[PDB]
Coordinates of C-alpha atoms and ligand atoms in Angstrom, one line a residue:
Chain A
X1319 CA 0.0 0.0 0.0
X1320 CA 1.0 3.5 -0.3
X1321 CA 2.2 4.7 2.8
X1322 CA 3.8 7.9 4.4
X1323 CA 7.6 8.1 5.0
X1324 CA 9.3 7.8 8.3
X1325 CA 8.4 11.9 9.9
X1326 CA 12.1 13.3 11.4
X1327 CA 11.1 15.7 14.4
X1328 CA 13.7 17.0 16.3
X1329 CA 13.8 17.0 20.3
X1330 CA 13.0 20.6 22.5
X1331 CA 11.7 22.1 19.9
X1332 CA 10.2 25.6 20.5
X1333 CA 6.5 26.8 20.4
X1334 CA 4.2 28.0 19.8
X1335 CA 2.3 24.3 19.9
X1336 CA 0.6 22.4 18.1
X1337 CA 3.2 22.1 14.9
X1338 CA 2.2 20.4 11.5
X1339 CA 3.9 17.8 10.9
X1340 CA 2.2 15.8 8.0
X1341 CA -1.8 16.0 6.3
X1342 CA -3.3 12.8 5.3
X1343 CA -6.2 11.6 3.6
X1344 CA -8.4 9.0 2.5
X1345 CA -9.6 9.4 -1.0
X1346 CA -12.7 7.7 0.4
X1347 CA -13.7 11.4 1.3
X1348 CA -15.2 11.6 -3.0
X1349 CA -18.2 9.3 -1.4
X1350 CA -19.0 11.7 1.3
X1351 CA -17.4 13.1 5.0
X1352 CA -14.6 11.2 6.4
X1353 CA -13.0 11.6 9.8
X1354 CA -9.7 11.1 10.9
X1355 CA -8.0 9.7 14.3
X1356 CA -5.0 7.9 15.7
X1357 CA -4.1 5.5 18.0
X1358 CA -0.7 4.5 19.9
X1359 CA 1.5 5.1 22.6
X1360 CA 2.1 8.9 22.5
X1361 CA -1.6 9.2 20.6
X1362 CA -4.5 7.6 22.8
X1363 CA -1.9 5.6 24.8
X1364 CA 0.8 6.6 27.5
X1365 CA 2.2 9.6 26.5
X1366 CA -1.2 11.1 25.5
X1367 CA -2.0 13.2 23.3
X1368 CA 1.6 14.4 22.4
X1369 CA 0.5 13.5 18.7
X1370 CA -2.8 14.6 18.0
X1371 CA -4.9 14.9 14.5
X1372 CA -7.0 17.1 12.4
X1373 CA -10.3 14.7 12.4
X1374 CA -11.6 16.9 9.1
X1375 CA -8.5 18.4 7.6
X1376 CA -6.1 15.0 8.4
X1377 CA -3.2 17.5 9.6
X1378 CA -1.5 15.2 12.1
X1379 CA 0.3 17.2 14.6
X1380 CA 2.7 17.6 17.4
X1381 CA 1.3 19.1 20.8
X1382 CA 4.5 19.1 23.1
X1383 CA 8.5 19.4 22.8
X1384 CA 9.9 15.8 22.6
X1385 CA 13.1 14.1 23.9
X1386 CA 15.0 11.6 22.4
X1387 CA 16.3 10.1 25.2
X1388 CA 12.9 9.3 27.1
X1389 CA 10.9 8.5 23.6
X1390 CA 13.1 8.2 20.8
X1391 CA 10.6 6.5 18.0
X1392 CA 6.9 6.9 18.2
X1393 CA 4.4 3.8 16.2
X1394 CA 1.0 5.5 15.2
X1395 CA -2.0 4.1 13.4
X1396 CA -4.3 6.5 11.5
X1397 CA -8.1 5.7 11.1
X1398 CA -10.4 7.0 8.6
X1399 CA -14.0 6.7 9.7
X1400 CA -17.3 7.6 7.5
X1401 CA -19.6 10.3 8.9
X1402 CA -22.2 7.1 9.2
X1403 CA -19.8 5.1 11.5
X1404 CA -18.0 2.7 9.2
X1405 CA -13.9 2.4 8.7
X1406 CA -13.4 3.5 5.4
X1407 CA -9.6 2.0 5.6
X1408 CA -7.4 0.2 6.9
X1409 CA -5.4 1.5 9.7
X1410 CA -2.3 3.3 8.8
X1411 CA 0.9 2.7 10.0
X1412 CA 3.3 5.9 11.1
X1413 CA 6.7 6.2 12.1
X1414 CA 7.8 9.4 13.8
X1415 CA 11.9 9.3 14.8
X1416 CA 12.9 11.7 17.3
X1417 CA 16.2 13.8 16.5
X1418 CA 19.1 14.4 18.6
X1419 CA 20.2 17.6 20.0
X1420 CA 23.1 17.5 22.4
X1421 CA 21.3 18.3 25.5
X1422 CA 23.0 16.3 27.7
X1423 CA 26.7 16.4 29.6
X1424 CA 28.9 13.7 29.9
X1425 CA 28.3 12.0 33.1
X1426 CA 31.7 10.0 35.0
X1427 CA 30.5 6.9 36.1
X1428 CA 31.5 7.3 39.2
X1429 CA 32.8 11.1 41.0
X1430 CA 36.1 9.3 42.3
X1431 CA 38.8 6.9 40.6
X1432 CA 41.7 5.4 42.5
X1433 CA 45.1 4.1 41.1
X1434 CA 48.3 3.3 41.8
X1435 CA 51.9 3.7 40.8
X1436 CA 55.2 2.5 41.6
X1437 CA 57.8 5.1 42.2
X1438 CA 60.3 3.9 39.6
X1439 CA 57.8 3.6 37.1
X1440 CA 59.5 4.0 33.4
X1441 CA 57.6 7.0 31.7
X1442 CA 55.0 6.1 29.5
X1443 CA 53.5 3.6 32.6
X1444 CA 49.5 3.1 32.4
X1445 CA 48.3 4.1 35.3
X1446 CA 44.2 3.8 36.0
X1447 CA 41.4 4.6 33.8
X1448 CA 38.6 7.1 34.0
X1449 CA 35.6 6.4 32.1
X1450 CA 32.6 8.6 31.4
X1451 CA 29.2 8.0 29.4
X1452 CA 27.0 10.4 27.4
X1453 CA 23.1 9.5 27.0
X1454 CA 23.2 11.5 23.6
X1455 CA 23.0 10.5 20.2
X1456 CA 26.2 8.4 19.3
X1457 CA 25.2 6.7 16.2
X1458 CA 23.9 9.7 14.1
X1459 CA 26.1 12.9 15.7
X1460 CA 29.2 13.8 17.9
X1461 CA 26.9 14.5 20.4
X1462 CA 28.1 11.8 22.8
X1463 CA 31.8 11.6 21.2
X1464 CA 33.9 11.9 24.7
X1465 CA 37.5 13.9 24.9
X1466 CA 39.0 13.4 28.1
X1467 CA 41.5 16.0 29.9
X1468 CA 43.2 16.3 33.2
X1469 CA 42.4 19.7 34.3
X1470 CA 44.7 20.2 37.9
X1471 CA 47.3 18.1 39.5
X1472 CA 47.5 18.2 43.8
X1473 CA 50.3 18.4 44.5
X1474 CA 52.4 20.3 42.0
X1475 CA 55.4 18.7 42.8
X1476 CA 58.3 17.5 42.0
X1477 CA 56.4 18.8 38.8
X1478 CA 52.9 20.3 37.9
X1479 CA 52.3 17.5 34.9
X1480 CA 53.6 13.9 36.2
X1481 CA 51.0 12.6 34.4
X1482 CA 48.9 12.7 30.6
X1483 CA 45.7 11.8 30.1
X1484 CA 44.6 9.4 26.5
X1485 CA 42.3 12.2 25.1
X1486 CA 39.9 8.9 23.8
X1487 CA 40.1 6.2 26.3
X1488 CA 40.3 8.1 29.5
X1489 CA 43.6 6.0 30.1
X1490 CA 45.9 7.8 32.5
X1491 CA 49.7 7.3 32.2
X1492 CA 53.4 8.6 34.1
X1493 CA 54.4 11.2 31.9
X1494 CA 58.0 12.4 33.7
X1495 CA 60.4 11.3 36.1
X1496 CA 60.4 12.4 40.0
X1497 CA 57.6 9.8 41.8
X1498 CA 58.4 9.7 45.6
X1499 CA 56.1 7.8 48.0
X1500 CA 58.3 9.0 50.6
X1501 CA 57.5 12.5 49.5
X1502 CA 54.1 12.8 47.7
X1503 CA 52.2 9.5 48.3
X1504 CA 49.2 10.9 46.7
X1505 CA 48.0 12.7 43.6
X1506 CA 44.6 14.1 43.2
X1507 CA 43.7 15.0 39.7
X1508 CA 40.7 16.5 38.2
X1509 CA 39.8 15.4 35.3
X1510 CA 37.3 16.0 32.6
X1511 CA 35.1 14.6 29.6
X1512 CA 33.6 16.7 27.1
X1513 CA 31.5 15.5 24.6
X1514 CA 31.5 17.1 20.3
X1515 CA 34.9 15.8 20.4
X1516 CA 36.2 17.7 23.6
X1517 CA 34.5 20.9 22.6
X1518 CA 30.9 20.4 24.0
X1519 CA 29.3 20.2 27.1
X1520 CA 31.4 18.9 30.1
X1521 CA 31.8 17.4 33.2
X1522 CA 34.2 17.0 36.0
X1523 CA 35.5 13.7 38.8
X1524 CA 38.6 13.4 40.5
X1525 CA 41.4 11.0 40.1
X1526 CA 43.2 10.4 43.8
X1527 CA 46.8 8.2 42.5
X1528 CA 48.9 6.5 45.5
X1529 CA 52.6 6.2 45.1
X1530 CA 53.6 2.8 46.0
X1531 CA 57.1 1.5 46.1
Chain B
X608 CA -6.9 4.2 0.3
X609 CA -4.6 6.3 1.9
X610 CA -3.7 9.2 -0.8
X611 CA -1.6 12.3 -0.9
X612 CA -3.6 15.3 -0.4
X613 CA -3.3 18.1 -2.8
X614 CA 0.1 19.9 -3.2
X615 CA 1.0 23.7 -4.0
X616 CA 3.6 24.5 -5.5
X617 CA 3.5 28.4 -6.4
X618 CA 4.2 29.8 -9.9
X619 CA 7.9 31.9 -10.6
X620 CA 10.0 30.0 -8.3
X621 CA 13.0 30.9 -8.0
X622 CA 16.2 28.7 -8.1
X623 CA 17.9 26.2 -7.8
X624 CA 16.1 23.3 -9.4
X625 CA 15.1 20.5 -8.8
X626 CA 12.5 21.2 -5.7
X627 CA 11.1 18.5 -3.7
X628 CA 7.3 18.6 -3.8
X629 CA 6.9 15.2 -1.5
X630 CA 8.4 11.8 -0.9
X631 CA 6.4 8.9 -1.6
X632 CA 6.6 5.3 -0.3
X633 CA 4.9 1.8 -1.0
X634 CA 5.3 -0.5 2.2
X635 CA 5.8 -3.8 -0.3
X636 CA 9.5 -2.1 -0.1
X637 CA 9.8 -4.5 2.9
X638 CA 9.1 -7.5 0.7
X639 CA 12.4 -6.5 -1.4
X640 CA 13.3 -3.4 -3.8
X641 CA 11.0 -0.5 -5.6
X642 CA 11.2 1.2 -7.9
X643 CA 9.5 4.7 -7.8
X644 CA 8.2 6.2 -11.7
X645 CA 5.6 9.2 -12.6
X646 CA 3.3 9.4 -15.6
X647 CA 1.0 11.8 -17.0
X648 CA 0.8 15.8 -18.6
X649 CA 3.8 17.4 -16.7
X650 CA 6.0 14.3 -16.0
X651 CA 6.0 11.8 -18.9
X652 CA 3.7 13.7 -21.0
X653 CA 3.9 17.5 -22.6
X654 CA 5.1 19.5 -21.1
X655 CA 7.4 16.8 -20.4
X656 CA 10.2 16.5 -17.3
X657 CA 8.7 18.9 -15.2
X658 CA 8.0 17.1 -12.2
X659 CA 10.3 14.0 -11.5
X660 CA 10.9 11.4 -9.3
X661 CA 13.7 10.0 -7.5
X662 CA 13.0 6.1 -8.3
X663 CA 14.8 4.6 -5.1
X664 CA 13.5 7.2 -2.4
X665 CA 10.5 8.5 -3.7
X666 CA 11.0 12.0 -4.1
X667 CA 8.7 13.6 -6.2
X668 CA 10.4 17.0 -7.8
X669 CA 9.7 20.1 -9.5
X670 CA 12.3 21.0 -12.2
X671 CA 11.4 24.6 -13.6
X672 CA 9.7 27.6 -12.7
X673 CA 5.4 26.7 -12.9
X674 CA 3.2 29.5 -15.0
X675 CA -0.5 29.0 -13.4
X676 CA -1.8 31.1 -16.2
X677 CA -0.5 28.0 -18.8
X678 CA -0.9 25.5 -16.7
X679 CA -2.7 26.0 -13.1
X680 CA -3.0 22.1 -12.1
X681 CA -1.5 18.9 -13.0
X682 CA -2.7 15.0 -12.7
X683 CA 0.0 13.0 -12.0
X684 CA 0.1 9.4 -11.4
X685 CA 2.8 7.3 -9.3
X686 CA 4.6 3.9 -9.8
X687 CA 5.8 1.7 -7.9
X688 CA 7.8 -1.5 -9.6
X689 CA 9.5 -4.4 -7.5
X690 CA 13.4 -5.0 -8.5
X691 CA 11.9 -8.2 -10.4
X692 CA 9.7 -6.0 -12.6
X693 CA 5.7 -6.3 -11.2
X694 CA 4.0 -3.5 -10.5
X695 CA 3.3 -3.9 -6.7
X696 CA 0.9 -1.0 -6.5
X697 CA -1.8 0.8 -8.3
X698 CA -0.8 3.6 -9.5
X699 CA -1.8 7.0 -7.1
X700 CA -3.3 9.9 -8.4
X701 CA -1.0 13.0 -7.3
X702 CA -2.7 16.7 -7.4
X703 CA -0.2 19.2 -7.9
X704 CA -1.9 23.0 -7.8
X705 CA -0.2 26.1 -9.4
X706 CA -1.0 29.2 -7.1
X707 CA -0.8 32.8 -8.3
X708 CA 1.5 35.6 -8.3
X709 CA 0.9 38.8 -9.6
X710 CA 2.8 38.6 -12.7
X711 CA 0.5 39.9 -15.7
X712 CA -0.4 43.7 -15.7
X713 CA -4.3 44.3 -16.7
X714 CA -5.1 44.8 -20.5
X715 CA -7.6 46.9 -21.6
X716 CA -9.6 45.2 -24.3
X717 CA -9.0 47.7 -27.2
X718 CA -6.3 50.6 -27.3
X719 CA -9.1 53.5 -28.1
X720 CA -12.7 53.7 -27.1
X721 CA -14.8 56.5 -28.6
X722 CA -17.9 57.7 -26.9
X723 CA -20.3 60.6 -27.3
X724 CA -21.6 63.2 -25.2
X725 CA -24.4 66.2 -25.8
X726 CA -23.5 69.6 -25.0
X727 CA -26.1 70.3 -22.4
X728 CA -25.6 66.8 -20.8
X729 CA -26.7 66.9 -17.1
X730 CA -23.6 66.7 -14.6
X731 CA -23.8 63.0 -13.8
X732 CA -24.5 61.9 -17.2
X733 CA -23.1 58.7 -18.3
X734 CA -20.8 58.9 -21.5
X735 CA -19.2 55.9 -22.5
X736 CA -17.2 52.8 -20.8
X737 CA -13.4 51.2 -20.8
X738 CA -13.2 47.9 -19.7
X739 CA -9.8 45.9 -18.8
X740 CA -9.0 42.4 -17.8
X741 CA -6.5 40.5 -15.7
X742 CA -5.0 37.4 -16.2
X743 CA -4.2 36.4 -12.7
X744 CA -5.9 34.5 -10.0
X745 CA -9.5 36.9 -9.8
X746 CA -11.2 34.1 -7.3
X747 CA -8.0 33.5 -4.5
X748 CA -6.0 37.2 -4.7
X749 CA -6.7 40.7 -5.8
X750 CA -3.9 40.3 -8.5
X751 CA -7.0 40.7 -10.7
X752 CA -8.9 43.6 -9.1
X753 CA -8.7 46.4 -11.4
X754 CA -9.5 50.2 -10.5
X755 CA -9.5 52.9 -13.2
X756 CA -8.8 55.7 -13.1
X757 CA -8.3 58.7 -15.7
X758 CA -4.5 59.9 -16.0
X759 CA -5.3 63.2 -18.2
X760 CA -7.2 65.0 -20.6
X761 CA -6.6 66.6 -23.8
X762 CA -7.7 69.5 -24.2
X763 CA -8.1 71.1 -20.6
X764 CA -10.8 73.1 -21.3
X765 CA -12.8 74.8 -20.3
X766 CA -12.0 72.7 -17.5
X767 CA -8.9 70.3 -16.6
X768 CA -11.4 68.1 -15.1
X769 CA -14.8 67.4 -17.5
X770 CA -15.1 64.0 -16.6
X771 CA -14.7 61.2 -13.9
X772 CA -14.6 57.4 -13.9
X773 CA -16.0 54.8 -11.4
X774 CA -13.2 53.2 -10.0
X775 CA -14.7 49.7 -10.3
X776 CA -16.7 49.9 -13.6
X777 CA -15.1 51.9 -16.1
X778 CA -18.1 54.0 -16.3
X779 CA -17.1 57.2 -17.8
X780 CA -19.3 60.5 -17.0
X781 CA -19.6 64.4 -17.1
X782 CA -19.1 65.8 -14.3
X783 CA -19.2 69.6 -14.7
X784 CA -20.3 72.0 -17.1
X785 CA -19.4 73.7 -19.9
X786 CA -19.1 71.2 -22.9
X787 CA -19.5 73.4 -25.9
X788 CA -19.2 71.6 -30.0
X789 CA -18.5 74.9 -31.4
X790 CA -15.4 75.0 -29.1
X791 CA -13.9 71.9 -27.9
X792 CA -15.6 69.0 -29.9
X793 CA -13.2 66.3 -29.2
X794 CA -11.3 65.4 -25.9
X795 CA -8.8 62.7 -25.7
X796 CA -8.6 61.0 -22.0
X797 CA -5.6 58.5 -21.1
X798 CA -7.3 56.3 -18.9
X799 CA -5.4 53.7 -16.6
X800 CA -6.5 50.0 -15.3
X801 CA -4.5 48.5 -12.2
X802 CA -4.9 45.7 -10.5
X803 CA -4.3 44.9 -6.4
X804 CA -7.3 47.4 -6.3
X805 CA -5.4 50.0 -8.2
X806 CA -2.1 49.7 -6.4
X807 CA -0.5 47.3 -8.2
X808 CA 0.6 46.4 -12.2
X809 CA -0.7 48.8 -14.9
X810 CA -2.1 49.6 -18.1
X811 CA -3.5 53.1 -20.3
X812 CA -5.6 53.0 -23.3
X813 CA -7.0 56.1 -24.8
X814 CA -10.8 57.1 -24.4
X815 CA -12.0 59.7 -27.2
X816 CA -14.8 61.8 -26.5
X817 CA -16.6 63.2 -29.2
X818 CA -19.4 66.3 -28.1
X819 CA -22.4 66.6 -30.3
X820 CA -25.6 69.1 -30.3
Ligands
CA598 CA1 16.7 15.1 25.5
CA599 CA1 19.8 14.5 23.1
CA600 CA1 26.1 15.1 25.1
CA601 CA1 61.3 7.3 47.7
CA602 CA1 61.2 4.4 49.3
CA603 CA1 2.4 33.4 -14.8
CA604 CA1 -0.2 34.9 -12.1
CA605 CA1 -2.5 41.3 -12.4
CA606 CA1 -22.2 75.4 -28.5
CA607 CA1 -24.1 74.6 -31.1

């Protein structure tokens, strides 16, 4: 059967609401009034009513902003009903797919790491690993694509960069000479992942390193 | 069945070309490839190539500038053809609707118009009539609503002003005093049509108004 394409609405749009966001018809309507409904989860099912439709004109709309990450795809069925009280079709199948916008931070999965290091440790030594995730769109955009940086070192000494950070894996690793347990047992770093390739929306958690022998 | 309702496209669009006008989609292109076509006055028809269609997405396309005053509406019709050659739809009527701009100034009906008038005529007497059309869209827009109106007079005597017009009708009447054969037998009015209720395109024609005993 002929069929409408896929609908691409992107999520937090702005009003005013409702929005258009296709017309359709039944060219049953040459035999006399037909009227128009639909059925689903985000129709007459939970989310209601975020979808509604025209039951004269068939201009199915959008009553609400939408997010991607809570609904991301919406099924619909559209009815065609005689002014007498007969179905004049088949139910319609519609597919409406959510777009991403990059509306949320990277989030650490956890606010503390802990590592350790041995003070003779050659440079270039892995370290620990900091992970983060991002509950954005990382199939379609760079929405979710995570740079990771160290942003402050406690102490500062013997040097203010003893360490690097993998700007992709989160991987932290000895980047200079100087590691004394009997000296500085413990680093605290702050660290950070950004999503958009490092140049989006950020967040911060702390990396606390021990100096072992 | 589920059908496309009418599209507008609007005359004098400018570029670039091709314009999509609608994507189309048979649901049998879960079965295995289809193949989009369009027929009919406009696509595979004179004026040929004007609307196209992409054959693997569907994407029905304008590929020129429209003229509703040549052609106002077209009937098309869509295919849709598995990979293996069978038609796996019946073809779909598509209503494509030129709408107006205001691209044809009005046209009086002749260039002169002679009319008459006795001497002693009453002020208010009726003399003669000018009469212009409009090619554009006269039930939608006022691109076809003409006023006239009288640009000069020839000679101005004894008055500038011997005559008026009615705005809407063309109507042409005395409205003073003082026609006199023996003096002034002849006077030559420009007259003007324009449309948008007389602020828009226009035309003049010549009204030539011969006074008698
Ligand atoms: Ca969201
Ligand atoms: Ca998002
Ligand atoms: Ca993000
Ligand atoms: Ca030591
Ligand atoms: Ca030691
Ligand atoms: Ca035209
Ligand atoms: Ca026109
Ligand atoms: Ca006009
Ligand atoms: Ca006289
Ligand atoms: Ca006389």
């Amino acid at each position: 059967d002929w069929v409408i394409p896929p609908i691409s609405s992107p999520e937090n749009e702005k009003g005013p609401f409702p929005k258009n966001l296709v017309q359709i018809k039944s060219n049953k309507d040459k035999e006399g009034k037909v009227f128009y409904s639909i059925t689903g989860q985000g129709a007459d099912t939970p989310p209601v009513g975020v979808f509604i439709i025209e039951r004269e004109t068939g201009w199915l709309k959008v009553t609400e902003p939408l997010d991607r990450e809570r609904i991301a795809t919406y099924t619909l069925f559209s009815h065609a009903v005689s002014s007498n009280g007969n179905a004049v079709e088949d139910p319609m199948e519609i597919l409406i797919t959510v777009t991403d916008q990059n509306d949320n931070k990277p989030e650490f999965t956890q606010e503390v790491f802990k590592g350790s290091v041995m003070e003779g440790a050659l440079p270039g030594t892995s370290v620990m690993e900091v992970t983060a995730t991002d509950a954005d769109d990382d199939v379609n955009t760079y929405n979710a694509a995570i740079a990771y940086t160290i942003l402050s070192q406690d102490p500062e000494l013997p040097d203010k960069n003893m360490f690097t950070i993998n700007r992709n894996t989160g991987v932290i690793s000895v980047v200079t000479t100087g590691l004394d347990r009997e000296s500085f047992p413990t680093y605290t770093l702050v660290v950070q992942a950004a999503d958009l390739q490092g140049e989006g929306l950020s967040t911060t958690a702390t990396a606390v390193i021990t100096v072992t022998d």
